[PDB]
Design a protein around this ligand. Structure first.
Ligand SMILES: *[C@@H]1O[C@H](CO)[C@@H](O[C@@H]2O[C@H](CO)[C@@H](O)[C@H](O)[C@H]2NC(C)=O)[C@H](O)[C@H]1NC(C)=O
Lengths: 48, 48, 49, 123, 182, 191
């Protein structure tokens, strides 16, 4: 279930809290690089 | 030259859900309580 | 969650909405076989006396 | 069995093992349906949010319909999942993208009587 | 005969982009002595045709402009904004609620209230079975009545009998009904 | 005079993705093209006993910002940062690769991921076997300057560019222009 109070991870929540209030692309770039661009919505675990 | 194909289906055990007094799950009833009182198509489409 | 294609029992979570035990698998086979051959023979003879 | 399919020759040895495996774990094939709005019955305010859910389902069906998706090559049934339309391939068809009802019409003006109509086309 | 003496030409361009394509190649046949003196005409294929880009032409996912802001009276100050792809379908933002949460009450009247929110009958309490889902009913039961003599295994593939079905998506849904409650 | 030339350039690169049982079917390659049946069943069981997380569906990551200090402001700024990240290293900047190669951006360097049965600097050598229809497909150009928010709409208007459809392939699929509602500090940042 995507819409809920999903328990965030310690590093993810910590980095999101350490983000500055004012728009700063520096930390935003590093967080996007470390954590990615998208999260899981649906999909099986089919092999290949 | 040749080519053959087959298809088969299995009629394995039935399933019959009880008509009334069905016991809902934890996460469903939890999400079903966060719904707004006033009508809101957007937030209602989420649980859909 | 009961035993599905695994051990005796697993444990789900509140954040996870579903665990499913339906089996589906796809396969493919595209075999190709070629073999060419060449055989040319030429002979000539000329004798004059 | 899926791996042995490369040399099938109408094999039947592993068929019994596959039958046993399906007996151990089947998959949903056929089923009857019923509206999910009838499942919310034991909440504090049942009727209110039940009618709200019925209205939400009506508006969602008005928003998303299988007719919106493009047709399929060979009698396929297109399904809408998110923002993409996938064709359900029937027996005898393959590929990544493999009569059907059309889109509903707009709700006519509410007449003097209760009677209000909506029409779908089998095109 | 040696049909490979006249090598196949390169496959031509696909006849159409996405709908349906046709491409063909032909033998580079020259009428020499080897061709006529070996009956190479009647036995060697002179063309090979195959399809290309057999998929469909899916239209581009086209969304619409946003609609007017919707008034909010929920217990959580969030407002909806719906529009008709990679952009989100509906994006919700914090709202300015003219009225906060209300109509708060206890759902259970003649039954037991589990701390997780589930409302089960009081008969299901102190029976040696987790009925609330978080072992709330059997928290501090001094004595329990054995409802089943021996621990039995559950039905296989029983969770698939509780999942919801989204008719539009072709993949039924996540879990909605509980199949562990007895 | 007798002259003879022999050349047997046979190669392979299986993609088998169970951690331990990977080596078996992949190393069975020597003189055994077809994989063993029992080894295949063992690998199937192993890959059942260990996940294969690939083949996913995605959703915007910035939506997970729900209950944090300065939640909505950080969410909007992460939206802007994700847009800037997406359009800063979009592979559109990279030049088109030969033989239908696919280009990527790793930092500040373009890498032409070669199609199967190809290699080289820009996927130019190794044209022995194509096994496809052929041609040169189309590629979308880089997004132009963003709209000045006259009425909220967008004016990126992605158009064709230096890699046009020439070898008879299909054009680049996608919209021509985009349109949305400009933020303008998101209605002065939510009232
Ligand atoms: C190459 O040509 C041969 C024809 O001689 C094809 O298969 C042969 O089949 C006979 C049948 O008894 C075997 O004795 C030979 O050993 C086979 N050839 C070889 C090279 O083993 C074969 O399919 C053709 N194509 C290839 C080898 O790729």
């Amino acid at each position: 279930n995507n819409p809920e109070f999903l328990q965030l991870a310690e590093p993810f929540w910590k980095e999101l809290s350490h983000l500055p209030s004012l728009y700063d692309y520096s930390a935003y770039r590093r967080l996007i690089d470390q954590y990615g661009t998208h999260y899981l919505q649906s999909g099986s675990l089919g092999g290949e | 030259s040749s080519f053959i194909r087959i298809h088969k289906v299995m009629k394995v055990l039935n399933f019959t859900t009880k008509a009334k007094d069905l016991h809902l799950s934890d996460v469903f009833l939890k999400a079903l309580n966060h719904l707004p009182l006033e009508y809101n198509s957007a937030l209602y489409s989420r649980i859909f | 969650v009961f035993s599905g294609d695994g051990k005796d029992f697993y444990r789900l979570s509140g954040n996870v909405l579903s665990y499913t035990f339906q089996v589906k698998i796809n396969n493919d086979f595209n075999y190709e076989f070629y073999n060419s051959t060449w055989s040319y023979v030429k002979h000539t003879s000329t004798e004059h006396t | 069995l899926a791996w042995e399919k490369g040399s099938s020759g109408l094999e039947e040895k592993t068929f019994s093992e596959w039958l046993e495996s399906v007996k151990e774990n089947p998959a949903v094939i056929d089923f009857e349906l019923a509206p999910i709005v009838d499942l919310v019955r034991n909440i504090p305010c049942a009727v209110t949010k039940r009618n709200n859910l019925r209205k939400a389902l009506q508006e969602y069906a008005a928003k998303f319909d299988p007719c919106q998706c493009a047709p399929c090559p060979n009698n396929g049934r297109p399904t809408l999942s998110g923002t993409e339309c996938l064709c359900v391939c029937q027996s005898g068809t393959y590929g990544e993208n493999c009569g059907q009802w059309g889109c509903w019409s707009s709700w006519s003006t509410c007449d003097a009587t209760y009677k209000r109509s909506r029409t779908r086309e089998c095109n | 005969c040696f049909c490979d003496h006249y090598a196949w030409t390169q496959w031509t361009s696909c006849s159409k982009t996405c709908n349906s394509g046709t491409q063909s190649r032909h033998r580079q046949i020259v009428v020499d002595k080897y061709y006529q003196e070996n009956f190479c005409e009647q036995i060697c294929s002179k063309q090979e045709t195959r399809e290309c880009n057999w998929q469909r032409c899916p239209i581009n996912c086209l969304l619409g402009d946003f609609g007017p802001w919707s008034d909010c009276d929920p217990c959580i100050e969030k407002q909806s904004k719906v529009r008709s792809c990679t952009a989100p379908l509906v994006a919700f933002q914090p709202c300015i609620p003219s009225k906060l949460c209300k109509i708060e009450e206890a759902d259970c009247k003649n039954k037991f209230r589990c701390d997780s929110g589930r409302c089960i009958a009081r008969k299901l309490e102190c029976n040696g079975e987790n009925d609330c889902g978080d072992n709330s009913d059997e928290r501090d039961c001094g004595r329990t009545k054995a409802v089943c003599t021996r621990k039995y295994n559950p039905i296989p593939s029983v969770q698939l009998m509780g999942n919801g079905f989204h008719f539009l998506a072709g993949e039924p849904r996540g879990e909605v009904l509980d199949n562990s409650f007895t | 005079a007798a002259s003879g030339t022999q050349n047997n350039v046979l190669r392979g690169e299986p993609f088998i993705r169970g951690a331990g049982f990977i080596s078996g079917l992949s190393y069975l390659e020597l003189d055994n093209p077809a994989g063993n049946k029992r080894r295949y069943s063992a690998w199937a069981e192993s890959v059942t006993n260990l996940p294969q997380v690939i083949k996913q569906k995605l959703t915007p990551l910035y939506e997970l910002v729900k209950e944090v200090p300065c939640a909505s402001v950080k969410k909007l700024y992460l939206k802007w940062a994700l847009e800037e990240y997406l359009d800063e290293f979009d592979p559109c900047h990279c030049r088109p690769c030969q033989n239908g190669g696919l280009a990527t951006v790793e930092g500040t360097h373009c890498l032409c991921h070669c199609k199967p049965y190809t290699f080289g600097a820009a996927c130019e050598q190794g044209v022995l076997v194509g096994n496809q229809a052929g041609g040169v497909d189309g590629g979308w150009s880089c997004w132009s300057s963003w709209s000045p928010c006259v009425q909220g709409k967008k004016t990126r208007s992605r158009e064709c560019n230096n890699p046009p459809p020439s070898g008879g392939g299909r054009s680049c699929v996608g919209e021509t222009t985009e349109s949305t509602q400009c933020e303008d500090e998101e209605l002065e940042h939510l009232r």
